[PDB]
């Protein structure tokens, strides 16, 4: 029983991190595509075109 | 309202000529929110679950109390009254270890859930600070389409935002050219693009049809009529000519 529970706990933590990345990617889909962005070096290096 | 429009490309003169047709549309749009909220039973689901979890796990913990954990009985008084010390400690240790281990699971799950809610609240704080106390050009960050204004409202353990947005509706075809040619020189438009209905040529804004007559007061000069591709010859008007003929 113990050797099961520990495993589950680890999974939960990892889940959070992955979401913390995916929720970032969505924003980069809707601010550096579908439009131009003036935030400095948010996408690429130097000024941004496409 | 005019200054709000000015930030997304629409010229200041549009609003002052269409005031009533905007006021009525805004009132009609506000009038639908009650029905929109009342239509779907899952309008507030994102809040409801937040309660249910914390109103459920606790219950399970109480139901946890019935396990005997490999002892001979569940209630604690029976072990004390029915048996003798030299092994009663051996009997008790199982129950104490089981319950002390059970409580930690609840503690850890509460930590993780609070850790998630902290991030959600931080995102809500950014939305409140950026999209009701100014204006944002980040596309799709606040609402769908372009952004004008927002209004907040409170609710049990949460907030609801109302966003106001501006959307073009009806569109028309046109034939265009990149630059214009005259007397060996080439003219470019300061803002907007050249639009021709098949008979003449005009300039216009990028988001609302409003023709004007081409002059030297809204274009400028660069290069020469040789390099650009697709250029078309035409005429150019000068405002000082009909005034200097006197």
């Amino acid at each position: 029983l113990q050797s099961l529970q520990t495993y589950v706990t680890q999974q939960l933590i990892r889940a959070a991190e992955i979401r913390a990345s995916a929720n970032l990617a969505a924003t980069k889909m809707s601010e550096c595509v579908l439009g131009q962005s003036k935030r400095v070096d948010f996408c690429g290096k130097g000024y941004h075109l496409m | 309202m005019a200054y709000r429009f000015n930030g997304i490309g629409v010229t200041q003169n549009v609003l002052y000529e269409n005031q009533k047709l905007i006021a009525n549309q805004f009132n009609s749009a506000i009038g639908k929110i009650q029905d929109s909220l009342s239509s779907t039973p899952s309008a507030l689901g994102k809040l409801q679950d937040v309660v249910n979890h914390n109103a459920q796990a606790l219950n399970t913990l109480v139901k946890q109390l019935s396990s005997k954990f490999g002892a001979i009985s569940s209630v604690l008084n029976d072990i004390f009254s029915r048996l003798d010390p030299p092994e009663a400690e051996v009997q008790i240790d199982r129950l104490i270890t089981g319950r002390l281990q059970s409580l930690q699971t609840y503690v850890t799950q509460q930590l993780i859930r609070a850790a998630e809610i902290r991030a959600s609240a931080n995102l809500a704080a950014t939305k409140m600070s950026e999209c009701v106390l100014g204006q944002s050009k980040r596309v799709d960050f606040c609402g769908k389409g372009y952004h004008l204004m927002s209004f907040p409202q409170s609710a049990p353990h949460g907030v609801v935002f109302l966003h106001v947005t501006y959307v073009p509706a009806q569109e028309k075809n046109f034939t265009t050219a990149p630059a214009i040619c005259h007397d060996g020189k080439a003219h470019f438009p300061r803002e907007g693009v050249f639009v021709s209905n098949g008979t003449h040529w005009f300039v216009t804004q990028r988001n609302f049809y409003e023709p004007q007559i081409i002059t030297t007061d809204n274009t400028f000069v660069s290069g020469n009529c040789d390099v650009v591709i697709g250029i078309v010859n035409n005429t150019v008007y000068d405002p000082l000519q009909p005034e200097l003929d006197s």
Binding site: - | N54, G158, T165, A169, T175
Partner: protein, 239 residues
């Protein structure tokens, strides 16, 4: 609450093997009709029994796997249906060398978004939950160390952060303003969001409609001792 039909999915098995299960055979699940097949389907996730396949595509409601969804609609007087997902409506764009398109008239819309901001606070008592007013249980418990010393801190962390969240979200302005006594604004109409003086409480119609659409848990704590002794002898979960 609506119907009584069911469908079964066997996970990741070639359901030619499924007929092995037999009602009279030594086995706990021994259902008859779903073991055999009158209309069966095969998916990369397993085998589906009880469903009827249809080629017409709809925006699907409940998921199964491998891009297959099930739904309940009046086909022919009605039975459950499974189908492949529909990506969405399609269009086309008339690209050209020297053609443009521009708008001529505008419309205004309003949209709604919802966000949670905090969670309910809680507290536990270490000794009562583990001994239940036993006498020497406390003596036997005092030896094991300091779990009861640190659980309280672990919970107090959340109990103190849950108020910092709300204090930070709603306090971006210091002063307190108020609307002018006259509600004229050149044509618009804000009577649905401003607070209503006639209500005995300082609230607004949208907030009032919101408050009654969520079932908050029991609370009030005005008086608690001896409540479940009298007319609440039918014990409620809270006490």
């Amino acid at each position: 609450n609506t119907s009584n039909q069911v469908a079964v999915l066997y996970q990741g098995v070639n359901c030619t093997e499924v007929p092995v299960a037999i009602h009279a055979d030594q086995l706990t699940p021994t259902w008859r009709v779903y073991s055999t097949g009158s209309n069966v389907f095969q998916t990369r996730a397993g085998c589906l029994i009880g469903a009827e396949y249809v080629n017409n595509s709809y925006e699907c409601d409940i998921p199964i796997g491998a891009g297959i969804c099930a739904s309940y609609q009046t086909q022919t007087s009605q039975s459950i249906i499974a189908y492949t997902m529909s990506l969405g409506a399609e269009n086309s764009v008339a690209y050209s060398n020297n053609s443009i398109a521009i708008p001529t008239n505008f419309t205004i819309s309003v949209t709604t978004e919802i966000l949670p901001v905090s969670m309910t606070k809680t507290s536990v008592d270490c000794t009562m939950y583990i001994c239940g007013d036993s006498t020497e249980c406390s003596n036997l418990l005092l030896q094991y160390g300091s779990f009861c010393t640190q659980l309280k801190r672990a919970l107090t962390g959340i109990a103190v952060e849950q108020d910092k969240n709300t204090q930070e979200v709603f306090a971006q302005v210091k002063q307190i303003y108020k609307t002018p006594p006259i509600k004229y604004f050149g044509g618009f109409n804000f009577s649905q969001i401003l607070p209503d003086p006639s209500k005995p409480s300082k609230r607004s119609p949208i907030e009032d409609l919101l408050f009654n659409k969520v079932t908050l848990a029991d609370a009030g704590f005005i008086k608690q001792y001896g409540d479940c002794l009298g007319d609440i002898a039918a014990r409620d979960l809270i006490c």
